[PDB]
Structure 1
Amino acid sequence: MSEVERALDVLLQEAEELCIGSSVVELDRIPTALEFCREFYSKNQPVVIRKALNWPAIGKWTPKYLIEALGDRSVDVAITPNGYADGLATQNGQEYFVLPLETKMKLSEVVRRLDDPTGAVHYIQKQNSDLPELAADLRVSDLDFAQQSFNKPPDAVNFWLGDERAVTSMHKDPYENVYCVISGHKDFVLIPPHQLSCVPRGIYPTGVYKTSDSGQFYIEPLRDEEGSDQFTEWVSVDPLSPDLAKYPEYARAKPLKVRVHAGDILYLPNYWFHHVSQSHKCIAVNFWYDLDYDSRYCYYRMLEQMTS
């Protein structure tokens, strides 16, 4: 055993005896700003709040209503064959990290495509900071309890509507994430940052899903300025069915499972690994806040260097 491995082992033993990030706290009432800063944000600790929101949206937002209120606008939608946009797929003997086919279609067309169990996997992800009627269905002020710890306005606000086959593979974000399911449920698999050395990562060629004239889906590699291949580091394990023979270290990881229902709020702290499934035609909005750096971030950068 090298010194790096004994360091990582001490880290893990200490976190296991202390059960750091060993569960997702569950609340029935929204906390106060002070409670949220002290108990969750300051400990980099996730929490789910049940039936927290009574926004109009939660009862009225569906595909049909959305087309109605949004004047059946054209949308930017993401399509894949396997349902793993930003995920791993093999082609011609080569494993790629593949981005979605991003095309434009009328909301109604999306709703027809989601209703086809045999078709491709579609989802809509829109980012910003008709939208006013949608905004009339929301009271963002109600998230003050969390926002006061971040002490800045959301750097992004995302709306999500898609197919149950759309699976978001395990990744980490540099954001505090306040996640509000509107219609349906989202299933999260969470892993704390300090378990980095238990989550196998590889370097993969970058590809994008593309349609042919015939209509069959294929992967096209990506190039840089010079024309050389672009690469992407990514988590190699599949939380839903992990290959522990190929990835023994993942045996030491301790994923947490949480289902977030309509009206619930999930706080996903920055740099937590998350893998997301969902229910068919689930609608959700989340709010991304740029993180404030402290020693934890420098420790995690050190951890990234120790996990070559």
Structure 2
Amino acid sequence: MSEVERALDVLLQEAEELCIGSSVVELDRIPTALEFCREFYSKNQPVVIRKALNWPAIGKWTPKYLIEALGDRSVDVAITPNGYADGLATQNGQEYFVLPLETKMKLSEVVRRLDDPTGAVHYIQKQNSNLSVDLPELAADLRVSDLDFAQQSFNKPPDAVNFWLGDERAVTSMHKDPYENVYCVISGHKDFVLIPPHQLSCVPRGIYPTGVYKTSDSGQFYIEPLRDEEGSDQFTEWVSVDPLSPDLAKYPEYARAKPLKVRVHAGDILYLPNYWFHHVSQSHKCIAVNFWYDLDYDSRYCYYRMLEQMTS
């Protein structure tokens, strides 16, 4: 082994022996603020809390209710042919990281498209705090103070509050965010696959030309490459593995990853700590809200940047 390979081996053997990030802790009761800070926030350690929330949104938010309550408002929706907004797709021999087609439409039309299992895949996943900016009325059916047990660790209000409503075919491919994430399913369920950041060396990442989905004259989807004004492809680094069906022959390093699986039901809270890898699937027409808080930087981020350099 190289000296870098020897060092990465040491990291992984130590983390394995000490069970770092080796499970998703399951709680049936909301912990105290101190508990959360000590056992989950400070260890960068995920946790799922079952039936933690009894917000009126839970049990009342349906497509019909939302159409009524919002007056069939026009909302931002992402559309893909293949179900992978912000995900890899191939065209004419080339693999692209592809951004969704984004458009505006009335909620009733979104619901109609969600009821077509062979049509294009629709997903209200704009995030960018779309709930507080675009759907503020929904806030009245939530109680954010119920998240104080976690927010005390972040010691600031959410930097974003997001609303998600999607087709079962809409899959969020694996990525990491520079946020603490408190994830609250409202209706249906979400299936998460999670990988700890210290396993970066087991997760293959490529550099892909970036494209965006567009529709042709005939309504057919294609990928429009993004180029800069110099004619160069705009590149995006992206996780290359499919956690649902990994090709261990192409990516043997992934064999050493220990992906964690967790289903999150209505009323459950998942704490997804900063820089954790996650891939997300959903039940059909699943509804969820989530709260992003900017991370607080310490040495772990610098070690992560070192890990990136070592695997480059």
Q: TM-score, normalised to structure 2's length? A: 0.97
Q: Distance in 1 between matches of 2:200 and 2:178?
A: 15
> Runs of 4 or more off by more than 6 Å in structure 1?
none
| Cα distance in structure 2, aligned partners of 1:266 and 1:119 | 31
How far apart are 1:19 and its partner, in Å?
1.2
Aligned partner of residue 223 in structure 1, secondary structure: coil
Q: Secondary structure at the match of 1:96?
A: strand
Once residues 205 and 223 of structure 1 are traced to their aligned partners in structure 2, the CA distance between those partners, rounded to angstroms, is: 9
Q: Residues 202-236 of structure 1: CA distance to partner in whole angstroms, max 9, x if unpaired?
A: 11000101101101110000022444210000111
5+ residue gaps, structure 2, are none
Cα contact 2:208–2:238 (8 A) shared by 1: yes
Q: Secondary structure at the match of 2:193?
A: strand
1:184-205 superposed Cα distances (whole Å, 9 cap, x missing partner):
0000000000000000001100
Paired with 1:292 and 1:205, the residues of 2 have a C-alpha distance of 31
Which blocks of at least 5 consecutive residues in structure 1 are unaligned? none
1:57 Cα offset (Å): 0.2
Secondary structure of the corresponding residue to residue 128 of structure 1: coil
Q: CA RMSD in A?
A: 1.0
Which piece of structure 1 moves more, 44-53 or 133-142? 133-142
CA distance in 1, matches of 2:157, 2:46: 20
Counterpart contact for 2:77–2:125, Cα < 8 Å:
yes
Find the aligned partners of 1:170 and 1:264 in 2 and give their Cα distance: 21
**Alignment identity in percent?**
100
**When the two structures are aligned, how many residues end up with a matched partner?**
308
Question: Which digits, 9 at most, give the CA deviation of each residue in 1:275-307, with x for residues without a partner?
Answer: 000100000000000000011111111111111
Shift of 1:273: 0.3
Q: Distance in 2 between matches of 1:133 and 1:301?
A: 40
Cα drift, residue 128 of structure 1:
5.7
**Cα offsets for 1:229-270 (capped at 9, x unmatched):** 100001110000000000000000000000000000000000
Q: Distance in 2 between matches of 1:147 and 1:222?
A: 39
Work out the CA distance in 2 between the residues paired with 1:118 and 1:229: 32
CA distance in 2: counterparts of 1:131 and 1:3, whole angstroms: 52
Instruction: Identify the residue that residue 8 of structure 1 maps to in structure 2.
Output: 8
Preserved CA contact (<8 Å) 2:99 2:211: yes
Distance 2:81 2:244 in 1: 19
Q: 1:181 to 1:121 in 2, by over 3 A?
A: same
The SS at the match of 1:126 is coil
Q: Is the contact between residue 127 and residue 164 of structure 2 (CA under 8 Å) also seen in structure 1?
A: no
Q: SS of the residue aligned with 2:125?
A: strand
Deviations 1:8-40 (A, max 9, x none): 000000011111111000000111110000000
User: Are the counterparts in 1 of residues 204 and 253 from structure 2 also a CA contact under 8 Å?
Assistant: yes
Cα displacement (A) at 1:153: 1.0
What is the Cα deviation at residue 132 of structure 1? Answer: 4.4
Do the aligned partners of residues 179 and 161 (structure 1) sit closer, same or farther apart at CA in structure 2, a change above 3 Å counting? same
User: Hey, what's the Cα distance between the residues in 2 that align with 1:66 and 1:232?
Assistant: 35
CA contact (8 A) 2:166 2:285 kept: yes
Q: CA deviation at 1:127?
A: 3.6
CA distance in 1, matches of 2:71, 2:151: 32
